[PDB]
Every structure is written in structure tokens, then in C-alpha cells.
Design a protein around this ligand. Sequence first.
Ligand code: NXL
Length: 250
Amino acid sequence: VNIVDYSDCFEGISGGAIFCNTKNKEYNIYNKELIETRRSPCSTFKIVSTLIGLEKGVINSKESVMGYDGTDYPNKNWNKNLSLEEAFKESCVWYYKKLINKVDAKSVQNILDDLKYGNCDISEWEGDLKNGKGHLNGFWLESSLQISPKEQVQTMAKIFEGDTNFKKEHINILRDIMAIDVNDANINVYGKTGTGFDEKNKRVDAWFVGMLEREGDTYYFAIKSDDSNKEITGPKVKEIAINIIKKYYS
Ligand SMILES: *C(=O)N1C[C@H](NOS(=O)(=O)O)CC[C@H]1C(N)=O
């Protein structure tokens, strides 16, 4: 366990980072207090909800659809019968809400318990209805479910090292749709962003969670901001993460 200083990559934004290589148990931690603090996963939960949907047969492949009903949305790309791969990349809320509402709560509870997914608290299934967004809400979006960045990395590692009961076929689908292009062919990066605002504490929850493969070694990582500036989003934290990866993990 090495405590490290990634502050220059954060360019003044409050946050922390954790990178873990489970082969040689090398844990690299920037801002330990934050890395151990549980927060809503927001859209990073789509990593797990994709696997839940595949395991339960709600979806079956990166092509699978959820029966778009014509509802109007401001994001152009939500207004179509999009595939799993597209819904993941566009973070399409209606697709993932419809997916998860086909699964019984006991099944979700037991999968989260098996994964040790933070507090595993799905008590507020409907989500944070006081924000007015109605059915665009759920337990994983600034609501009952909370997970720390360290726990995110532990979950990512358990999934992608083959240590869960999820089918290998399904984990490979998730790998495919999480892959990102960082304009460096010598590292394979995979991940997912998330963005929320913590009304109680007046701070963002901005995430980039995933893994890095670099010639033999694999690092599971979570980058998290808790800045008070509402301009700090998941995509901004992904930029910070990529800067860290290129500086220290190339
Ligand atoms: C998930 O965090 N969300 C869904 C969507 N994607 O956000 S992301 O670009 O950070 O991945 C919009 C924000 C958020 C939400 N409001 O539900």
C-alpha cells in the first residue's frame, strides 16, 4: 500500500484515486480518507446492472434491445430502440431503469450481497424522488445505495478476474462495451463515468471506475471527485483519470 500524490493531475479539483494490481498486491492510493468514503455510485452502477440483466436473461448480448416506446427525451440518442452497447455508452437512463425493474428485489439484494457492493442498500428502490425526475431515478442515483472507491475497485477486480459466478460470456460482453480509446495502443483502458449531486453535503459525486491492462499487468481503478463545483462531472473526472494513467501507468 503506497500513498501517492496525484494532485497535479487533478488540476485543483478535490478528489482521490486508487489503483490496485492484484497480481503483486500493489495498492496505490491518493487521498485515503476519500477513497474509503461510501457515496452513491450513480451511473457507474451500470457495470453491475448490465451483469444482472444478462444473468437474469432480460438482455442477452451487446445487441439486445429493451423495447423503446417512443417517449421524447432531450438526448437524441435515447429516442430510439438502442442496443445494450449504445445504451451503456450513452448512459441511457430509461433503458437501464426498464431493465432493472424487470428484476425482483431479492435477486438484486443477493447479487449485491455476493459482490460486497458497498452498503448493499436497495431500500429506496424508486430513488431520490424529491428531485422531481420521477421514473428517471433509482436506488443507485443519489439514493440509498452507497459504495466507496476502494469497494468499487474490489468489486471490479472480483468480476473481471473471474471470481464471481457471472458467466464468462457475460463478463466479456461487459468488457467489450466498457472499452475506451485513449489514443495509446499500448494500454487497454475500460471504464464507466458517473455524475450526481449530493444535495445534503452540496458536493458532486463524479466518478470514473474501470481497469487498465498494460503488457501482463492489470490495474483496477476508481477516480472520484467530491468537489463543490457543479461543473465537475464524470466526464471531467475521466479526463483526470486518463491523465493519471498516461503519466504514471504507461
Ligand atoms: C449517471 O451517472 N447518470 C446518467 C447520465 N450519465 O452520466 S455520466 O455522463 O456521468 O455517465 C447522466 C447523469 C446521471 C444521471 N443524472 O442519472
